Amino acid sequence: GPVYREYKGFRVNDNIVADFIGVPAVITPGETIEFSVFYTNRGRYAYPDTGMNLVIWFSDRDDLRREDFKLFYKVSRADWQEQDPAKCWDPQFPAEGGVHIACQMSGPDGGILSKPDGTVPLPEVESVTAHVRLAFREGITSEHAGIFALPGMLDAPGDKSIIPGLFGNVFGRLQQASFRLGEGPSSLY
Amino acid sequence: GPVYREYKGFRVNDNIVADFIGVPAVITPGETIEFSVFYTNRGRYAYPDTGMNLVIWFSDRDDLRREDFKLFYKVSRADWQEQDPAKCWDPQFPAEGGVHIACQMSGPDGGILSKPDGTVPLPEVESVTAHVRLAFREGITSEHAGIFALPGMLDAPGDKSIIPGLFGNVFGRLQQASFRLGEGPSSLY
Amino acid sequence: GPVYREYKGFRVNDNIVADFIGVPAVITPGETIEFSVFYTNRGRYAYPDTGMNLVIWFSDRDDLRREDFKLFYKVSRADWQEQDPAKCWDPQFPAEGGVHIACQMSGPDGGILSKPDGTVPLPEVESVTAHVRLAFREGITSEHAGIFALPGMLDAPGDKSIIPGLFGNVFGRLQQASFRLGEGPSSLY
Ligand SMILES: C[As](C)(=O)[O-]
Ligand SMILES: [Cl-]
Ligand SMILES: [Cl-]
Ligand SMILES: [Mg+2]
């Protein structure tokens, strides 16, 4: 099996990486944006089952909850679905401030890598995409926030997920997108 | 010399990587977009001649052809040029469905790295960019598509390219940008 | 402690990397954009003090100076500030032409990683963000330009910065965003 690192209490394989496309640096409260995010096997160990997790983090307030935004996603060429609030981690409060909401966005990918039994194996060099639609409710703002892509994997076939609500017992390399939720910049000239 | 990996029947050097800037997650049919893509030598072997290849992929249909889109590019500081359909690979059809069209975007870079003899060497840490204009014809859509960046390189001076229509006998690390070709998202609220 | 590579006359630790969010591939002269940029410790050596440097590069002209654009930034959840022209490197002129202007954008991050003594240590997996507002004066254009992210670190606490005007005596992995400064693309159809 592959080499894992310890981070908090979890096992991380940096060879499974994630990339964002189309995240804006400023998001307007109330408006819907669409971006894509995808994880790729940059190693040589083929995982038997995989799925994406998305983390939304506010650094400057701790009152954000799952119900403060609407979240839809589509795994590659499968159909759109609404992200399930039951498949989220409970709010986490880092000692450095803020709160983050981790949401599972897994499932079949339209039969590209996914198999009849529902698994999404991930051979080397291959990738899985989530097209993601996101909107925060009006009336909430943050001056330093982030979306994080947290790829999840099952190391061995038959393994169970280890964080309640999220996919995987091991995880890939965390990828970040920093943004502000608020008003865009006024003209400097 | 550098170490290569096998992928299909080709040689890949993961130290030559590519990055996209400004690709949108949703592209309107008929509309022209501009993005940039660039490849960087993150290794220590200086390549004698290099050029970018671009792949357009639809996962949910197989009728896309080179004639269905218009494509222009400029290599770093050189002038714009129309991409040559003769310098493309034939449509490729993955066993899981869909189609992709690989298009060569090579040429001198405006005298930054390029040499009088026409080659574009790539010393370590240096990079080459393509500014890219792209438009799909109206009446064609895809709900899960991608642009892939495929850096191509000549291992030795005087080598010949190995995929007909594309540049290079060895290749860098494939980079992806997933998007949809269709209508932007309606409001979630 | 970490291993460094030589580049020009400086020391580079490729484990400190940087990512861009929201840079457009075409910037309108006179218009203000906001993007984000952040550096992440992908290694295991915790640097005692860190800060971001940003380089603005035109490849096709050499008359650009710091006074030709306006530049503001905000380190994570700290406050907005105007970038200080005295904390810039002198204009640098590549032998092939063009000019680039390197600007320091360091400072505390709102007490996320920053400490009372003002330092910004960077433990493993952690990151620091700069939200950036940028505008070029109208009447200036470039057909191949770039923003470069240059993380600076102080290896060991007592070290002093090695490039006057910039933060750090060692540096992280340079990250690029290529763009044009001018008019957007006219329709190809
Ligand atoms: C309509 As025809 C796609 O086969 O160019
Ligand atoms: Cl050839
Ligand atoms: Cl930070
Ligand atoms: Mg370049």
Numbering used by the authors:
A (entry chain A), B (entry chain C), C (entry chain B): 9 to 197
Question: Which statements did the authors publish about this structure?
Answer:
In this work, we report the identification and characterization of a small enzyme AvmM that can catalyze the construction of a 16-membered macrocyclic ring in the biosynthesis of alchivemycin A. We show through in vivo gene deletion, in vitro biochemical assay and isotope labelling experiments that AvmM catalyzes tandem dehydration and Michael-type addition to generate the core scaffold of 1. Consistent with the apparent molecular weight (66.2 kDa) determined by the gel-filtration analysis, AvmM was characterized as a homotrimer, with each monomer adopting a jelly roll fold. The overall monomeric structure comprises of eight main β-strands arranged in two parallel four-stranded sheets, and three small β sheets. Using the DALI search program, AvmM shares low structural similarities to some components of large proteins, all of which adopted a jelly roll fold. Additionally, AvmM has a long C-terminal loop, which interacts with adjacent monomers to stabilize its quaternary structure.
However, AvmM shows no sequence homology to proteins with known structures, and it contains only two Met residues, which prevented us from using SAD (single-wavelength anomalous diffraction) phasing methods to determine its structure. Therefore, we generated a double mutant variant AvmM (L60M/L113M) to incorporate two additional selenomethionines (Se-Met), enhancing the anomalous signal and showing no impact on the activity. Consequently, the structure of AvmM was determined by SAD phasing using a Se-Met derivative crystal, and the resolution was extended to 2.09 Å resolution in a native crystal.
